[PDB]
């Protein structure tokens, strides 16, 4: 009646039938894989039917927030006040360990552009603003030529799939930043302004791009949308756990035998994923020291908890971390966790928005103290202060990256505090 375990998602049920780039990513191959089927009725059925299956699917946020897509998109179902409604797609891929979007932009672009069209119909939006990271050049052009093919087929824009709706698609290439991944910075960066995220609520559903009703969405979040409506929300709700339904690409990287990404059912025991696709962490399972479940922002977790913990938003939560973006990063025994964290939070300093006080002063301060810990010149007292200033960073920032950089520091402290302490005594001994 219900799935006791999870995993081994049916290959027919794998939404991204070209995620490995082993099929024609042009228009002809895409529709040969099920893409662009009966979009007419999908567009004709209106926002009510499209959002209904989104509610039925219960698609959780695939961009690193986990917010239910249903009511997020339902904010657009509202009569127009004159300001044209827009839909933007976040393709920044800023998070270290994120690779899921990068492959599927070029490998199955037409599925993505059809995802915007279905999403925009429910959204009542006018134009699509896919904000691709500037470093992602070749894939961005790959997606844009796909849009040209769709335009020549009369699938988007004027009379989208012969349904009367008019939906334009624009691929805006960024100029390189983690911060642009944040939804308000993406709006700010699209507007030509500095890539600095704006404050909280005025809402994007009300005040978005150019002061118009918009809503950001992760590429995978809108990529699954066509496959959602064609097969109903009942497809996606069948897999996954309780309100952790569905599948997701899993970026397995780090000290593993076969570093790769793979679409698979979500809420799967973490040991199964790293052992099946990655062939286990190099040097065996016991060689595993810690796992960053999804994205750098989510705190790392030691192997003592990595034995079972299912890969879903809730299960990571009692695991004192988050699912984030399902970017599995695996450190081995030989890995220096203190060095790895310092490298991780040094990245946050470089990719700091700079606007708000905490994430700018604190994260750079986090660099200085954590660098001292890696060398070991620090003193044992400073361990807890780093925890305190981490809490000062948390929840006091306009941007969520501040909390995205405080969590790794807290996770490192809570799970490997003796490691720094002995490393700290080592410095105090040889230096005398």
């Amino acid at each position: 009646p219900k799935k006791t375990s999870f995993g081994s998602l049916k290959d027919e049920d794998r939404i991204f039938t070209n995620l490995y780039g082993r099929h024609d990513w042009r228009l002809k191959g895409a529709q040969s894989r099920g893409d662009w089927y009966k979009t007419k009725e999908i567009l004709l059925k209106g926002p009510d039917w499209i959002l209904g299956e989104v509610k039925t699917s219960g698609l959780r946020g695939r961009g690193g927030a986990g917010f239910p897509t249903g009511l997020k998109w339902s904010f657009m179902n509202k009569p127009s006040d004159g300001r044209p409604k827009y839909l933007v797609v976040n393709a920044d891929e800023g998070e270290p360990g994120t690779c899921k979007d990068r492959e599927i932009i070029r490998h199955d672009p037409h599925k993505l552009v059809e995802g915007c069209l279905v999403g925009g119909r429910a959204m009542g939006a006018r134009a699509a603003y896919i904000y691709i990271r500037g470093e992602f050049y070749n894939e961005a052009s790959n997606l844009q030529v796909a849009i040209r093919e769709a335009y020549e087929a009369g699938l988007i824009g004027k009379n989208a799939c012969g349904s009367g709706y008019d939906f334009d698609v624009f691929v805006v290439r960024g100029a390189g930043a983690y911060i642009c991944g944040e939804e308000t910075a993406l709006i700010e960066s699209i507007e030509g302004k500095q890539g600095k995220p704006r404050l909280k609520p005025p809402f994007p559903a009300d005040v978005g791009v150019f002061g118009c009703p918009t809503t950001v969405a992760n590429v995978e979040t809108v990529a699954v949308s066509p496959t959602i409506c064609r097969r109903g929300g009942a497809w996606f709700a069948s897999f996954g756990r309780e309100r952790n339904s569905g599948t997701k690409l899993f970026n397995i990287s780090g000290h593993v035998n076969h570093p790769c990404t793979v679409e698979e059912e979500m809420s799967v025991p973490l040991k199964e994923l790293i052992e099946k696709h990655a062939g286990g962490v190099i040097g065996g399972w016991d060689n595993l020291l810690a796992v960053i479940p999804g994205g750098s922002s989510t705190p790392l977790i030691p192997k003592s908890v990595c034995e079972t913990v299912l890969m879903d938003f809730d299960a990571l939560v009692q695991a004192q971390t988050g699912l984030g973006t399902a970017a599995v990063i695996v450190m081995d025994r030989s890995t220096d966790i203190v060095k790895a964290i310092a490298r991780l939070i040094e990245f946050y300093k470089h990719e700091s928005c700079g606007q708000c006080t905490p994430c700018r002063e604190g994260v750079d301060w986090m660099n200085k103290v954590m660098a001292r810990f890696v060398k070991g010149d620090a003193r044992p007292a400073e361990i807890d202060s780093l925890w305190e200033i981490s809490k000062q960073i948390e929840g006091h920032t306009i941007c969520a990256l501040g909390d995205g950089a405080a969590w790794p520091v807290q996770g490192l402290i809570r799970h490997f505090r003796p490691e720094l302490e002995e490393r700290m005594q080592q410095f105090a001994l040889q230096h005398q």
Partner: protein, 214 residues
Amino acid sequence: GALFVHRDTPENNPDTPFDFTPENYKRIEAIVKNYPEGHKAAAVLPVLDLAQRQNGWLPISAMNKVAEILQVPPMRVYEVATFYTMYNRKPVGKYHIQVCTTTPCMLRNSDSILEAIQKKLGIKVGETTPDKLFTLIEVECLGACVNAPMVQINDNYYEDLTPKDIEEIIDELKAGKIPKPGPRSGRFSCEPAGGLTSLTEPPKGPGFGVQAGL
């Protein structure tokens, strides 16, 4: 560098010769018409990128000139030029040697690759070759973390590198030869190193479990 107070210099003077090609101008107008009127300043970022393509680096005259084509105050262009990453405010080599050392990317010994480039070029991190072809500067996560430590050569992605794999790639660029942008192994884009564990059989064709007329 890490400098953000531009000083007028003989090459980077406000009268530095810069323009846009007739081919370029029709590209900017395409960028402008792509965006709604009343907010055409939103096209500053693509246009600034386009200037970078035309004349390599971005002199202060180039940043000033694109400001006038966008009817935007010149400093507002200055802010976005010095806040993002690939906007080269100073001259760079013909090939920008980009490398990622973020934790998910450095776990597979990105230092060995970075060191191998440094010794082969005789160029330390930050500077360019004496002949002005290569500039090795370190960058954060570029997005391909699932692959082995990769390098972004000017504008194309090379993945699954190795302290040996960059060596013949670099001297290819030295002796007027481009390699194939992609992983330097059997893996094509992101497949498992041991083989293929997903998308085994042919995918389902158009039409599978559609409920009623949809």
